[PDB]
Structures are given as structure tokens and as C-alpha cells.
Amino acid sequence: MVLSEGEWQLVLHVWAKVEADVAGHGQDILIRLFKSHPETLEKFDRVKHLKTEAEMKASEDLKKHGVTVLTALGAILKKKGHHEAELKPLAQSHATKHKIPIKYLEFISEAIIHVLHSRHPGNFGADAQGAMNKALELFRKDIAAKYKELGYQG
Numbered sequence: 423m424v425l426s427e428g429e430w431q432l433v434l435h436v437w438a439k440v441e442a443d444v445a446g447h448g449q450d451i452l453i454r455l456f457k458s459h460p461e462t463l464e465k466f467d468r469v470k471h472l473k474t475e476a477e478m479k480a481s482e483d484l485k486k487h488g489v490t491v492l493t494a495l496g497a498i499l500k501k502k503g504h505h506e507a508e509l510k511p512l513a514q515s516h517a518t519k520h521k522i523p524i525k526y527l528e529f530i531s532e533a534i535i536h537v538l539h540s541r542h543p544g545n546f547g548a549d550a551q552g553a554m555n556k557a558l559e560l561f562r563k564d565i566a567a568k569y570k571e572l573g574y575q576g
């Protein structure tokens with residue numbers, strides 16, 4: 423699948439807003455993920471034991487993870503589809519070290535979309551959301567292909 427330049431512009435335009443507060447958005451997203459799909463919290467050894475949203479908000483490790491996710495994703499989105507190099511080490515660690523099924527990447531995509539909608543309503547109308555969904559689908563499709571090469575496809 424291929425995004426048009428106009429769809430990339432919509433994606434990179436909200437993303438410039440996200441980057442004003444990387445740590446805050448990373449928290450919101452990972453908390454949304456863990457509340458909506460608690461099975462995902464089990465994958466994170468530093469943070470599995472957290473019981474409430476208040477504990478989550480307080481956690482420095484959760485905040486570090488959030489910043490790590492959003493910084494890596496940002497770097498991918500700014501490639502506008504030319505992201506083969508960036509994807510290789512990410513696919514390898516998530517397939518063979520962490521063991522993250524594709525389904526979980528769908529869940530975090532849903533969390534990203536929810537949080538951008540809440541925090542950026544003026545820059546995240548229907549066409550911008552469509553374009554973000556297309557960019558994240560492209561990311562997932564390319565990761566799934568790499569999982570398969572690596573021997574996992576989960």
C-alpha cells in the first residue's frame with residue numbers, strides 16, 4: 423500500500439503536535455493500551471506488577487517505555503514509507519526477544535488513534551485519522567512480513 427504525499431502531510435502535521443510533549447503522549451498511550459487490553463502489560467517485566475492507573479501514572483519506567491516507543495515510531499513515520507532499515511532491528515527484537523503478536527500491534531495502533539483524537543481534535547478530523555490509520559496499517563503490514571522472514575509471524 424502507498425500513502426500519497428497529502429496523506430503523509432496529514433500524518434506529519436499531527437505528529438509535530440505529539441512531539442511537543444513526547445513523554446506525556448507516551449504515558450497516555452501505554453496506559454490506554456494496558457487498561458483496554460491488560461494482557462499486554464504482562465509483556466513488560468519492569469512494569470507487570472502495576473495494579474492501578476494511578477500507579478501507572480507514577481511509574482518512571484512506564485514513562486521511559488512510552489518515550490522509547492514514540493521516538494522509534496516517529497523516526498519510522500518521518501521516512502514516509504522508506505523505512506526498511508528502521509524496521510529490521512525492531513522486527514527482530516519484537517518477534518524473537520519480546521514475542522509480540524501482530525494482534526498486540528493492532529491494539530497499540532488503536533490506543534494511538536484514541537489518544538490523538540482526544541488531545542488533538544482540531545488536527546485529527548476524519549481525513550487526518552484515515553491517513554494515520556493508513557500509515558499504521560502500512561507499518562503493521564511491513565512488520566508482519568518481516569516476522570514471517572524471521573520465522574515468527576505472530
Ligand code: HEM
Nearest residue numbers: 462465466467468490491494495512515520522526527530
Ligand atoms: C508502535 C509499535 C512499537 C514500537 C515502535 C516499539 C518500539 C520499541 C523499542 C524501540 C524498544 C527498545 C529496543 C528493542 O527492544 O527493540 C521496545 C522494547 C519493548 N517493546 Fe516495543 N514497540 C512497539 C510495540 C510494542 C508492543 C505492542 C508491545 C507489547 C504489548 C511491546 C513490548 C516491548 C517490550 C517488552 C520491550 C522491552 C521493554 C523492556 O526494556 O523491558 N512493544 N519497543
